[PDB]
Amino acid sequence: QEVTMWGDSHGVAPNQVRRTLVKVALSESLPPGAKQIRIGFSLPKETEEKVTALYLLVSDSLAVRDLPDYKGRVSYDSFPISKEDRTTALSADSVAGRRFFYLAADIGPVASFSRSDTLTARVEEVAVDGRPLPLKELSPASRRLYRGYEALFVPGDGGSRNYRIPAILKTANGTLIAMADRRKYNQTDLPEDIDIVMRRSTDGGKSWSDPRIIVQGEGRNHGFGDVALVQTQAGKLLMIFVGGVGLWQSTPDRPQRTYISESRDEGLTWSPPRDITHFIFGKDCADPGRSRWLASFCASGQGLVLPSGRITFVAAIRESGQEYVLNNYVLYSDDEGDTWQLSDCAYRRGDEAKLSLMPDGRVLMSIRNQGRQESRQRFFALSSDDGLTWERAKQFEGIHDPGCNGAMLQVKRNGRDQVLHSLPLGPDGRRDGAVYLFDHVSGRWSAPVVVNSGSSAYSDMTLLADGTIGYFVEEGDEISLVFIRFVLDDLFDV
C-alpha cells in the first residue's frame, strides 16, 4: 500500500475556487478495520496569504485538472480546512473505498501578478489510524497567478474525448472568438473524425458562451480542422480550415480540401463551408504548374489582413509525392475572399508559418522548423511587396524551435517596437510554453518567460483592447485548450 503524490503546476487567477494544490492516490482502498485517515501537509505563509479557504476533496477519479474543470463529470466530496491548519482527517466510511485525495484552495483577491506570486503546498504524511503510509512524489506543486486563466476546452467536454489546435480572434467590436479541433474519438489528426467547435466572449474574456459545433465531421476521412481566423477590412469574420483525408494521404485528384466560411454577426452564425482548393492546387486548379501538387494547409491560428485590405494566410504545400516536405506560399485575397491567389514560394522545406506587420510596413514570416533542420532554430522570412515575394531573414533568428506552431504579436513596450513570440521552450520537445520579446532596433531576443510549465504545444495569441495579452495554449499530454491573460509587465519586469 503505497501513496503517489502529484503537485499541481497549472496557472491560477484571483477568486477561483477548489484549485488543486496537491493530489494523492492510495494504491488500494482502505482495509476493513481502518476507521480514519489523516493527511498532514505543508504550505508556506506566502501561499496561505493568497488563499481564502482550504479543502480536502475525495473522489473515485484521479484527474489531471482542477475538479470543477470537468463540469460534474468528476464527482467528489468536499470537506473544508481552516487555512491556518496543516492537518485534516476523515473516517474510512466517508472515504467509502475511494482512493484519490486532493488538497484544494480558494484563491484570494490578489492583485500583484509579478513573477514571485507562485502558490504551492505539499503532502508530508498520510496515516491510516496512525500507521503512516509510504509516500512518493512524482511532481512538485507551483501554480502561478495570472490576471486571467481558464480552460476553454477540456477532454470529455460535450462528449468529445479530446481537443487540439487553438485559434483565437478579437474583433473590432471586442468580441473574442475561440476555436478548436473537436477530436471526438482520440487525439490524432485527420483522417480521424473531427469537428470544429467554438466559444465566444463578449466581455473581454471574463466569461464564455457554451461551445457550439459549427462544422461537423461526418466520419473517418470526412473530418475538419486546423482553423485559422481573420477579420477582414470590411468587417466580416473569415475562417479557413481543412477537411478530409490526412495531409500525407492527400492527392491531386483526392485532396484534403481547404474551405472558408464567413460571419457577419460577430461569430454567432457562419456561412456554409466553401471549397477553395481549386485556387491552390490539384485536379480543378487553373494553373497547370500546380495541377500535380498533392496537399496544402494553412497554419492554424490567425492569418493577417494587411493595411491594403489584402487577406493572407501561409499555406504549407506538398509539391512532390517523392518526399515528405512542404514549401510555404502565401494564400491571399484582394476581393474580401471572393477569389484567392498564391505568392511565389516563400520558404523551402517549411511548415506552419505565421505573418505579422513590421513597423515599416514590410511583412515578417515565422516558419516552424520541421525535421530539426540546421540549428533547430525558428525560421524567419521578410516580404517588402505585401506578401508576393520573400527572402530569408536570418537576422531575426535566435530562438529555439522544437518544431511547433506558435504566434507573433507586434507590441509597443516602454516606447519600443517589439515582437512577442510564443513557442514551447523545450528543449527538443513540447514542454514549458513560453513567450519571447524581439527588440526591433537592436535585433536581440529576450530570454524566454515560461507561461505554462509542463507539456505545452500549439499556442495562438491576441492583443486585447487595453494591451493585455490573450494567450491560448495546448496544455498537458491529454491536451486542454487554456486561455490565459497577462500584461507584459507581469512577465518581463524585474
Contacting residues toward ligand FUD, per CB under 6 A:
9, 64, 454-455, 475-477
C-beta of 142: minimal distance to ligand FUD in Å?
A: 10
Q: CB-wise, 387 or 424, nearer to ligand FUD? A: 424
428 belongs to an annotated ligand binding site: no
C-beta of 135: minimal distance to ligand FUD in Å?
A: 18
Gyration radius from the chain CA atoms = 24
C-beta of 76: minimal distance to ligand FUD in Å?
A: 18
What distance in Å separates the CA atoms of residue 494 and residue 492, rounded to the nearest whole number? 7
C-beta of 453: minimal distance to ligand FUD in Å?
A: 6
CA 175 to chain centre: 19
What distance in Å separates the CA atoms of residue 376 and residue 403, rounded to the nearest whole number? 8
Position closest to ligand FUD via CB: 454
One-character DSSP codes across 436-486: EEEETTTTEEPPPEEEEEEEEEEEEEEE-TTSPEEEEEEETTTTEEEEEEE
Q: CB-wise, 39 or 141, nearer to ligand FUD? A: 141
CB 414 within 8 A of CB 440: no
Q: CB-wise, 64 or 190, nearer to ligand FUD? A: 64
C-beta of 41: minimal distance to ligand FUD in Å?
A: 20
Q: CB-wise, 83 or 183, nearer to ligand FUD? A: 183
Q: CB-wise, 64 or 196, nearer to ligand FUD? A: 64
Strand runs (DSSP E) across 159-290, as ranges? Answer: 162-170, 176-183, 194-201, 212-215, 223-231, 237-244, 257-263, 274-275
Q: Which residues of 179-211 are buried (b: 16+ CB within 10 A; e: fewer)?
A: bbbbbbeeeebbbbbbbbbbbbbbebbeebeeb
C-beta of 64: minimal distance to ligand FUD in Å?
A: 5
477 belongs to an annotated ligand binding site: yes
- Residue 36 pairs in a beta bridge with 91
Q: CB-wise, 64 or 228, nearer to ligand FUD? A: 64
What distance in Å separates the CA atoms of residue 490 and residue 112, rounded to the nearest whole number? 8
Residue with cell 484570494: 108
332: nearest Cα among 267, 251, 420, 260 = 260
One-character DSSP codes across 69-138: GGTTSS-EEEEEE-TT--EEEEEHHHHTT--EEEEEEEE------STT-EE--EEEEEEETTEEPPEEEE
CB 81 within 8 A of CB 457: no
Q: CB-wise, 302 or 452, nearer to ligand FUD? A: 452
Q: CB-wise, 20 or 369, nearer to ligand FUD? A: 20
C-beta of 479: minimal distance to ligand FUD in Å?
A: 8
- Work out the number of other CB atoms within 10 angstroms of the CB of residue 136: 9
Would you say the C-alpha torsion 292, 388, 421, 484 has a positive or negative sign?
A: negative
What distance in Å separates the CA atoms of residue 421 and residue 442, rounded to the nearest whole number? 16
Q: CB-wise, 151 or 176, nearer to ligand FUD? A: 151
Give the 3-state secondary structure of residue 351: coil
Q: CB-wise, 64 or 178, nearer to ligand FUD? A: 64
354: nearest Cα among 426, 412, 404 = 404
C-beta of 455: minimal distance to ligand FUD in Å?
A: 4
C-beta of 170: minimal distance to ligand FUD in Å?
A: 27
320 belongs to an annotated ligand binding site: no
Residue numbers in the known binding site are 431, 455, 477
Q: Which residues are annotated as a binding site for beta-D-galactose?
A: 431, 455, 477
